[PDB]
Amino acid sequence: TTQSPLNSFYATGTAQAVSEPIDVESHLGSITPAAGAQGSDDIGYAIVWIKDQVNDVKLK
Amino acid sequence: TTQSPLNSFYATGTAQAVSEPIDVESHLGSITPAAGAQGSDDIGYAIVWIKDQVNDVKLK
Ligand SMILES: [Ca+2]
User: Fold this and answer.
1) How far is the CA of B37 from the centre of ligand 1 (A)?
2) A37–B15 C-beta distance less than 8 A
3) Dist CA A3 CA A21 (whole Å)
4) How far is CA B48 from CA A6, B17, B24, B30, B58, in A?
């Protein structure tokens, strides 16, 4: 009568990667010496947000 | 779908040197001897303002 191939069974899921691993927002400052002067000053900072299940980051 | 180069992260600051290292203002006087005379006298002074993060100055 009917001979089934016994293959018509399926299960399906989805995957996505919609975000980059890091986000960088800058809060740097300024360097204001006189002409030819020597000095040092703190510039500011830069926030590096870490995204989903990211544990170690290697940057350049 | 989309292959990111992972380069579009930036942080920016500014620098400026808007002033010369020194300012010189003069308060000198006068030399008033007779014709052919020998003497000595104090002339005056000259103020040398020092600008931002300047520590050592070499002048001519
Ligand atoms: Ca200095």
Assistant:
1) 46
2) no
3) 51
4) 98, 19, 5, 20, 12
